[PDB]
Design a protein around this ligand. Sequence first.
Ligand SMILES: [Cl-]
Ligand SMILES: [Cl-]
Ligand SMILES: [Cl-]
Length: 502
Amino acid sequence: MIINGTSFEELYNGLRNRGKDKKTIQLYVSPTVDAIVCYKILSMMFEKDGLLHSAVPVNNYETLSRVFKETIGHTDVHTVFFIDCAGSIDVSELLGDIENIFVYIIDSHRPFNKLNVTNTNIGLITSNEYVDSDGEFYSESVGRVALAIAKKLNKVENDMYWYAAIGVCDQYISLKINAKTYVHAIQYFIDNLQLETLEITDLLQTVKTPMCVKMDCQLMLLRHWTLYDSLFHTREIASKLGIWTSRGKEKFDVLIADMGIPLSQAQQSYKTMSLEMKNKFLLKMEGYSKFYHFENLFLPSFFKKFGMDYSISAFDAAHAIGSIITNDEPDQNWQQQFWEGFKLLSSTTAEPYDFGFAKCIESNKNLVETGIILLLSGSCFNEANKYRFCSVSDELLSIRFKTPYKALQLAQFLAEASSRRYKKWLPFILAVLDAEKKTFVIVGYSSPISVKTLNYFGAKFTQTAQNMKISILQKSFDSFVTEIHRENLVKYKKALHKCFTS
Ligand SMILES: [Cl-]
Ligand SMILES: [Cl-]
Ligand SMILES: [Cl-]
């Protein structure tokens, strides 16, 4: 059933009543920054009311189902929340015995599964006041729904708007919402906090509010990086400027010179680059944005002051947290990285964000450098407008990306970079030589832009593995990892193509 604002009071009274009996709340969190925001906002309310709760970071529905089965009937869990997952699948079919517990779902995927909607024992939470998935697009941020609960119940703390801003910035960064939807969300925060949108030239040193909004130039981590490298690594802008082509760095340097900015200025920290150079950059970029049609580069940013530092926007924070929760070492996993992301989100100081900024910067420098090479040199093809396939067997690149957690990051980058280059979004299958094991690591990745065909991509990718009798080493909600013998690359490509023809 659909739960809206008129039912939030009854819902929370139930949590309170069941919480007196020593029972607990279990929140299953899928791996998005928005999902962490939702958990955080709910957890703030729960803490204030003494409601025991726990987090279950889930990476796929198999894990969700296994923990649920191990939990129900074996502990004091009386209520479960599924955050940014489960809304668009047949939950009753997945989990079965569900009707003894209180099951709530806060998920941005739409449409909801019809059997979820008609089941009186499944609470699909929306903010209104009036494994096949049915998902076809993304709606309201899950953090925004948690904020809506707090507002309806008179439990809002104004810090929740910072978290909610990070959540909707995550949706926009992740390509789940468009710029108009993002701006409308910010306007909601402006209205409820009675803020004014400050000008892009405002450095915020005189603002009297602990949070604020100003027009901004949305180059990735610009204030925490350099003009030169922030511009080169902002994917939509780099694609439209054509600076990732052959000799793209020579063309880039020509662009920087066209702005009248020396490299000694463009390549130092943006915070120490002179204001005169910043003014030149802004004016030139305004013109470039109309010529190359990236006017959506200029969007309002939501800021929170940390001590004397007002340089961290909700976009900066979403980039930093998104990087922290990306697995990038062999011992990193979502169960642990969820808590690292929660800890950073919860920071009341600026210094913790430096680690996230650094991880994001380093990853993007590595991915863009490798990715440019592969799109120029690699064996990358579009197979029947079903998927792009690329295989890498060069000694140096292969050794660097043969591990699944690295290959997954490269596949995600290439999925976006190739789609922007050819103005055609497809899921991406990447094969990387593991020369020591005599195998290719195979990663399949589907970006949020391709969510409407994720059912088919996952089904056929997994059916190919089944036909080849190779193992799915890992799966997430939007990606898969398998591995083949090196000598079978052609055999595997033929099987994949056949499957994706069925
Ligand atoms: Cl974007
Ligand atoms: Cl807009
Ligand atoms: Cl990386």
